[PDB]
Amino acid sequence: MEEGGDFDNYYGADNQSECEYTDWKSSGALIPAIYMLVFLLGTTGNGLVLWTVFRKKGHHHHHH
């Protein structure tokens, strides 16, 4: 659950986020929308397709 046999954490792993916490809360309330609406769009049917095709066209050369 914690890679690296030397994790100090506590006031050291988040001490860096405490600075972004003030930003994320701002750029993390209206930015996730587009991201998703854009992710589940070009990252839902695109990967599957390009993936499926790469197995139908790659299995040979091009449109058999």
Side-chain angles (χ1 to χ4, degrees):
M1 306 200 301
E2 263 177 317
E3 324 204 80
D6 201 353
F7 264 44
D8 208 274
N9 99 277
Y10 129 82
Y11 221 135
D14 293 292
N15 164 46
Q16 84 201 296
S17 160
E18 84 201 352
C19 290
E20 162 160 277
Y21 158 94
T22 55
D23 242 51
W24 145 82
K25 189 181 221 183
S26 304
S27 337
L30 44 140
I31 325 304
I34 276 272
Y35 251 81
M36 276 288 124
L37 197 101
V38 165
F39 192 99
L40 56 116
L41 248 173
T43 342
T44 282
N46 123 93
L48 186 64
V49 160
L50 301 177
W51 172 88
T52 286
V53 167
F54 269 46
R55 269 155 29 83
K56 96 193 276 267
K57 276 177 197 61
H59 228 254
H60 281 128
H61 219 151
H62 162 255
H63 207 289
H64 310 270

